[PDB]
Amino acid sequence: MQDAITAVINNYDVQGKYLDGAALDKLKAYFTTGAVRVRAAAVISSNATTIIKEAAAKALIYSDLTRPGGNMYTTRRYAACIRDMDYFLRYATYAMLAGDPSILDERVLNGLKETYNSLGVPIAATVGGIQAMKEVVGGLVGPDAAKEASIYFDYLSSGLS
Amino acid sequence: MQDAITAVINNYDVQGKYLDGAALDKLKAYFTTGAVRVRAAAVISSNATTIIKEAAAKALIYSDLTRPGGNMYTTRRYAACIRDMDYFLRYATYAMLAGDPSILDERVLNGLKETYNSLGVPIAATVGGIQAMKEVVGGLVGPDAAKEASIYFDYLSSGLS
Amino acid sequence: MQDAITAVINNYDVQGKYLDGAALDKLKAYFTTGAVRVRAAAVISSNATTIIKEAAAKALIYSDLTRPGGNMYTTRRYAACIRDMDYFLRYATYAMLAGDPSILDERVLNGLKETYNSLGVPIAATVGGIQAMKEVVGGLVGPDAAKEASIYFDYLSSGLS
Amino acid sequence: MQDAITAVINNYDVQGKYLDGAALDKLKAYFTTGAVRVRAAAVISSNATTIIKEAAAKALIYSDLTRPGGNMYTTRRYAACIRDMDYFLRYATYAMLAGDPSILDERVLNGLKETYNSLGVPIAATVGGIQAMKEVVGGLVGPDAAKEASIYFDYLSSGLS
Amino acid sequence: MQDAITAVINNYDVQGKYLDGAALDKLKAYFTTGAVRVRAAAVISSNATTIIKEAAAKALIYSDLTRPGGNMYTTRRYAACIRDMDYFLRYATYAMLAGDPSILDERVLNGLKETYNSLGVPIAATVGGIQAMKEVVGGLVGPDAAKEASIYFDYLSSGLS
Amino acid sequence: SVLTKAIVNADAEARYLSPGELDRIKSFVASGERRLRIAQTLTEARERIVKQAGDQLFQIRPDVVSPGGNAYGEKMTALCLRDLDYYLRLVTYGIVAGDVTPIEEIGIIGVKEMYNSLQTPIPAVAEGVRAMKNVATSLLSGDDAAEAGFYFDYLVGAMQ
Amino acid sequence: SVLTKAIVNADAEARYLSPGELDRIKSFVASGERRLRIAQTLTEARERIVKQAGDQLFQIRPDVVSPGGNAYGEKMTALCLRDLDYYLRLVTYGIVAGDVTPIEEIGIIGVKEMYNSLQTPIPAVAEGVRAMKNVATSLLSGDDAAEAGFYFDYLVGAMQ
Amino acid sequence: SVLTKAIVNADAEARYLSPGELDRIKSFVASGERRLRIAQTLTEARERIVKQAGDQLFQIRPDVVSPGGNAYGEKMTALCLRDLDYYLRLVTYGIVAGDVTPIEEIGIIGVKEMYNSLQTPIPAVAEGVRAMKNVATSLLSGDDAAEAGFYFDYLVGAMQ
Amino acid sequence: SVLTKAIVNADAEARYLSPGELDRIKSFVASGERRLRIAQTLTEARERIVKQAGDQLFQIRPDVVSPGGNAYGEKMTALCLRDLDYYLRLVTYGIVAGDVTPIEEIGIIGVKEMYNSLQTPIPAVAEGVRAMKNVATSLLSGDDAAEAGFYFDYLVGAMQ
Amino acid sequence: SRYFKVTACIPSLKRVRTGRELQNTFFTKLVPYENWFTEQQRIQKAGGKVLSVKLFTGVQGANTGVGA
Amino acid sequence: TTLGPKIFKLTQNVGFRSKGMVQNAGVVTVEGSVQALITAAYQQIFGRQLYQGQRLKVAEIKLENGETTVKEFVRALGRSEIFRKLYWEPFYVCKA
Ligand SMILES: CCC1=C(C)/C(=C/C2=NC(=C\c3[nH]c(/C=C4\NC(=O)[C@H](C)[C@H]4CC)c(C)c3CCC(=O)O)/C(CCC(=O)O)=C2C)NC1=O
Ligand SMILES: CCC1=C(C)/C(=C/C2=NC(=C\c3[nH]c(/C=C4\NC(=O)[C@H](C)[C@H]4CC)c(C)c3CCC(=O)O)/C(CCC(=O)O)=C2C)NC1=O
Ligand SMILES: CCC1=C(C)/C(=C/C2=NC(=C\c3[nH]c(/C=C4\NC(=O)[C@H](C)[C@H]4CC)c(C)c3CCC(=O)O)/C(CCC(=O)O)=C2C)NC1=O
Ligand SMILES: CCC1=C(C)/C(=C/C2=NC(=C\c3[nH]c(/C=C4\NC(=O)[C@H](C)[C@H]4CC)c(C)c3CCC(=O)O)/C(CCC(=O)O)=C2C)NC1=O
């Protein structure tokens, strides 16, 4: 994986360049937002379970999805689905701390679209589950962090569609 | 895998034939070159490291390959490349002892072309690394063994291209 | 480990004897109590968790054992202890079905006394945990099965002391 | 394995005591020496190889130990011995950072005396190898850290004798 | 393991001595008996099964050992016992070829006394099984080899008692 | 601690500590006296924090102190504030260590079984800890209150 | 970085980041501005550091620039200083990130095998790095010189 | 062969051949012409060797060639000698290879299952092979007869 | 030896020696007197060989015996020839054993770690051994010189 | 981090091993604390006998410091 | 059979057996059969050998000294550091 900082280091390493003014400006733009990323992660982590619960309630359950014939019918599959939800939330929190989406590609999106096609897992319904968790997250983390958390949920959801 | 001798045995076994004159002539043609194969292997094995170093020096390093942007840039990848080189040398030595290239297909070439395409490993540059080790080998092993060692390096290199 | 039917078969097989009226009488004495053993097992299995809970409540917790300095202090230790309790209950249920204590020796008691000495696990306190589960079991299974279940709990507890 | 901060907590936990004034004074006595421990570790780590070399030169080699019949005769055993030396140095550096010798017992001394008796490894000679590395270490780390590094080398050496 | 020849080489290596007259005399004393060792091994190997059968017949079966209560009662244990016998015969043949008992210690005797105590395997009865195979072996191999084969059977049997 | 967590990485790769690892030990230890002050203040007000936590928590979810509630009665309740006293303590052993290893060995390892076995309602319990946050946090400066708050929210997180 | 290292340990455990590892990051952020500044300073004097390192090296070990020496001759010396320029660059990277991370992948893992092939004496490369420490360190304030020095001593350590 | 066996062990331990492995290849190849002569003699007398094995077999077991026997009849006997011809062929292969790899894959692995299906008495096939040893061995010098005999006794061994 | 190697493989597969294994013991023992003569000649000239190899090692590597060289000085050179005397001795052992078991346990397993500690350049030790091959080989008949040469090239191989 | 010391006799009644299985039946080995329960039971289930148990590495009722 | 790959089983005592041999014997012998087992562990678990820093000693030291079995040497290697790193970390979770 890479973060903001190693994204820059590797981009310069392939050119064998010492870090110059443009590089140093990018890294500053990361460091200057760093404390806010940490606070936001502590809110998400400590509200993890409630975010999933409120996101499922707005976007998944009370529906045909949870009824016989639906993909989140059976305690087995309901458990698998909210298990997935926890992955998304947790990794988006990593991406936002790192200030780089590369981890969402390497460890979450790669092959996932076809995995879901192969099992029958409804993609559009999963995206709504992602964009509902974003909605909840953006309330809990506040002005400071709302836009920055949000983008990695949006990265996740355009990665499936 | 198979060698000269088992190549003949299996070719006759599928016909259920006892070994006949033509078979016996082939096996003789192997046994009669056997002592020379052994001596050649002992030269290659004991000069292994020097062959790689002289082959890399003529065909790989002092170049864009070892510079930033090049596939053998980074100590990691330089190490992986000369590691590979040792495989080639070592297996070619097996093929030449066996007097059969089948091991080069089973344990070296199978899937390797696409593996290199997938990682970005430069094929043409790797072939030159093979044909440089051949050049060195042919000097070290002498008249007796030069042609016989050479062919399995040539087998390796037309297996990639 | 053997059952009841082959603990008699092995007693007569280290003699060369056949099955003599005496043998057949023993086996009858087992078969004739068999149906009663089966439910009793169905009561224990289906009340497993409640038996442990009531046995711990009468004989382990609300005490120095669960307080700092006590062996079942820490969630890790408390979990290990009631895990053990489940083993005892479960195996005693096997012994009682088999009508033979040999499984309690082979798979539970062997080395356990010294294992507990080595970790510091309080033996006397563990016996009370066994004899409390027996008390609960004897109520739940009824007149039919009370004495028969009870003995394998008593086997367990004199195996430690 | 535990340290000074951790030991204070466990030592009080078994008594179920809040940290009180006496505890808080102990922890201060650790924190107040902490920066010096770090600097000392960076000197030892970065001079690791030279310390072993100078310690072996003063206390092991140029001797019957390295001659036929000696335990550090053969490149195999010479390698094993200075391998060991590196363990000692490295772990003593851990003990000194932690401000607690418990790791030296758990991961180094336990069974080592008898292991050395069983292989024939000379104990007295190994102690001199420890006390020579201490001598070198105490020069390199300076007034600040000399006494504190020294004690865990002395812990090691009275652990063998 | 070691044989006659490597016994001498390692005894001199630890002193870093080139082989001298005394060493050279020892090695001659081995080489000069070598052809006879080979012939003896070919007799033992090719009569292996008959030696075990005649040794068991004189020293094990037709007894309480093979009756209920006996350690070689059951086809399982009878099989294990003559399996063992084959080990002894086979390894003694190795020791005698090597002209060194070290293999009998490394791969046969180490821990075996206690293994037999732990299973209940009768030691004295096993020794008689060894000394009966020796008796048979000494007839089959003849004057040339009788004394030399015999000693490694005697090594085996005083290794258990 | 930070030491325990980190050295473990050193030993596992058979090596001395990195410049990075050394730096964090240095920054960590510099933040010592403050962490010790945060633990002292909270140790000094433990009885108040527990008691006021106990009043607060039976508003946000009372049912636990009712006929069919796990904490119904005087001694089912008192074992309840004592558990709240336990967790506040752990929130302070951990504060001086600068990480969770000590807390974890003594309290969140295999803690979802004690409770499941006891059928104490665990998720109410997380709420119980968040409340020791509200009281404790009102006895600390803004900066110290946040630093403390992370450890309260961890426990709340682990009971989940 | 410090970030990468913290996270990788977090994800391996599959639980959100702690308190004790959500701190170090804060220290690093404050440190990073200073860290970025030190790297820039080192970058400015690179040619002087390399050249003076190269003189200090060849006095201390004249054998490498002698008949049977790996660096004997005008080029064989040119490539040698270029390698010294490489490692100074990696040292600036390490300082800025706050964790050594990328430098390891770029220039120590595989370095034994590379230099053994080329027949380069490894311990005299370690000396060239000490020589650079001495020069670079004389262009930095006491506090910044120490912070830089840890990364120089790491490279010296890894070539071992 | 001896080659295949040596190499497979080499490659599986990721290494070049041992002095031992090299020595046996050398001793083996020196016996090449001799081994080829042993195969030639036996190939040259194949038809004789099968009829004398076949006579030796039917005396010792007249039952196999009896009402309830697997080889009862003219064409149940014809197939039986053909199987004896198969195994003599494999024995010539083994002798020139210097081990059983070829003999094994072609005619022992799976042989229990094959013959159990056909309900052929395996141990009387082993006898047919002993019978061939006796005939073949009478057409070879003492030294060559022993070398051949090992491969006959192997097949006899594998049908067991 | 050849014996030890054959047997260890036999015992490890729980079996008597193979025809192959028996053959190599026979060929080996037939070369006994010859192998003993090869060791005698070389033992008899051990001084000549070690000194000469040192002059030739120090010609291709003049700096080992130079300011920053491992063998620089009169007693750093004395120990260097003593090591050359050690390896010639082990080569005589190997020749009479017919394999490397003894050579290996005594002087290659652990040799990288030993010399890395002493900071001895390994590949120039390999050169010292080639130099000894050249001298020793000039005191032996063509056939015996080759047989000896395999063991010299092995040591050269193992220091790699 | 704690380790156990262990002694056990593992016996195979019906499998039948030809060569050298003496290491195979009786052995002493160090096992970690977290794998002991499973190891112990791997041994009871195949008829083995456990001669002794050694911590080797821990302390008896250590509340902290134990950890994995 | 010979139709599949070799199986290495460490029967060779190991154990630091000792004997009736010279106290500081040079040749020792057969503590080189363990060594091939040790490299063959690496060749299954990672597929190749590791580089110099990488190998896990002090797991081998114990296997070689006879203190732990083959089974536990595999466990140490499996749960190790570079094993995680090479094979877990860079891939999608189920590919890993
Ligand atoms: C056939 C397998 C299967 C089961 C059993 C199942 C249960 C299930 N129970 C639910 C809610 C619920 N279930 C209960 C049940 C109870 N409340 C209590 O206190 C009592 C202990 C218990 C009644 C005995 C309650 C109160 C909710 C609402 C919880 C909420 O909305 O947060 C929901 C979410 C609402 C929905 O979308 O349907 C599911 C999926 N789903 C399944 O696929
Ligand atoms: C670490 C990164 C990672 C991710 C994200 C991941 C996803 C993932 N989801 C899976 C299944 C699944 N995923 C879901 C998800 C859902 N069901 C619905 O109806 C909703 C639309 C949605 C939840 C919002 C369900 C129901 C299954 C079970 C399919 C089955 O029954 O086989 C599986 C198959 C294996 C298994 O069942 O566990 C994987 C690998 N695996 C990974 O390694
Ligand atoms: C960023 C990671 C990285 C490094 C460090 C690296 C080093 C590196 N050093 C090289 C050569 C060299 N390096 C040196 C260095 C030295 N000679 C000495 O004696 C001294 C000990 C030392 C100088 C301090 C010399 C003399 C050569 C030429 C060797 C030859 O051509 O045989 C080469 C081959 C030439 C080339 O193609 O560039 C590489 C790739 N490559 C990399 O990708
Ligand atoms: C036993 C038979 C066998 C072979 C031959 C083999 C080759 C092989 N080469 C690899 C990578 C590689 N191979 C090279 C090779 C080179 N780089 C260059 O620029 C040169 C042209 C060339 C050397 C002459 C490099 C640089 C990589 C690393 C690619 C990466 O960074 O992922 C990998 C990927 C896994 C790994 O990194 O180790 C394999 C499997 N694997 C095998 O199992």
Ligand SMILES: CCC1=C(C)/C(=C/C2=NC(=C\c3[nH]c(/C=C4\NC(=O)[C@H](C)[C@H]4CC)c(C)c3CCC(=O)O)/C(CCC(=O)O)=C2C)NC1=O
């Ligand atoms: C330091 C680690 C640690 C903890 C935390 C711990 C808790 C613990 N809580 C207990 C009981 C209890 N704990 C509670 C707690 C509650 N009731 C509720 O409804 C609320 C949700 C909650 C209060 C916030 C109650 C009511 C009992 C009595 C349950 C019973 O007796 O059945 C007991 C059994 C009584 C005893 O023997 O002490 C233990 C061991 N033990 C430990 O070693």
Ligand SMILES: CCC1=C(C)/C(=C/C2=NC(=C\c3[nH]c(/C=C4\NC(=O)[C@H](C)[C@H]4CC)c(C)c3CCC(=O)O)/C(CCC(=O)O)=C2C)NC1=O
């Ligand atoms: C299948 C048969 C079987 C049994 C029965 C078994 C028992 C057993 N109990 C253990 C520990 C333990 N056992 C207890 C038990 C108790 N603590 C108390 O205070 C009470 C008196 C008692 C519960 C009533 C505790 C607390 C430990 C943990 C000791 C430690 O911290 O290391 C361990 C050590 C490994 C581990 O921690 O899991 C074993 C093997 N193992 C088995 O394989």
Ligand SMILES: CCC1=C(C)/C(=C/C2=NC(=C\c3[nH]c(/C=C4\NC(=O)[C@H](C)[C@H]4CC)c(C)c3CCC(=O)O)/C(CCC(=O)O)=C2C)NC1=O
């Ligand atoms: C029989 C198995 C065996 C070997 C081979 C062995 C070698 C060995 N070589 C040593 C030193 C040495 N060896 C050398 C050798 C060399 N310097 C070079 O540059 C060349 C590459 C090479 C000569 C060809 C040097 C220079 C030293 C001194 C290193 C020092 O003191 O730091 C030492 C330490 C000094 C001592 O106490 O004896 C040992 C033990 N020990 C053994 O038990």
Ligand SMILES: CCC1=C(C)/C(=C/C2=NC(=C\c3[nH]c(/C=C4\NC(=O)[C@H](C)[C@H]4CC)c(C)c3CCC(=O)O)/C(CCC(=O)O)=C2C)NC1=O
């Ligand atoms: C992580 C903690 C740890 C330590 C400390 C450790 C020591 C240790 N030293 C050993 C052997 C040894 N240790 C030495 C040490 C010495 N020789 C001398 O003459 C000197 C007096 C001394 C060096 C100063 C030697 C020579 C051997 C090899 C014995 C043999 O040939 O079997 C062995 C046997 C396995 C092996 O050979 O690697 C162990 C386990 N193992 C561990 O896991």
Ligand SMILES: CCC1=C(C)/C(=C/C2=NC(=C\c3[nH]c(/C=C4\NC(=O)[C@H](C)[C@H]4CC)c(C)c3CCC(=O)O)/C(CCC(=O)O)=C2C)NC1=O
């Ligand atoms: C390669 C070297 C080697 C040896 C020698 C060896 C012996 C050995 N004998 C065993 C058992 C045994 N050994 C015997 C032997 C005998 N019974 C008698 O009554 C007679 C006195 C005697 C035969 C003469 C029997 C009966 C058993 C089975 C014990 C049981 O039932 O568990 C076992 C236990 C595992 C097993 O059952 O296979 C071993 C390891 N193992 C080895 O690895």
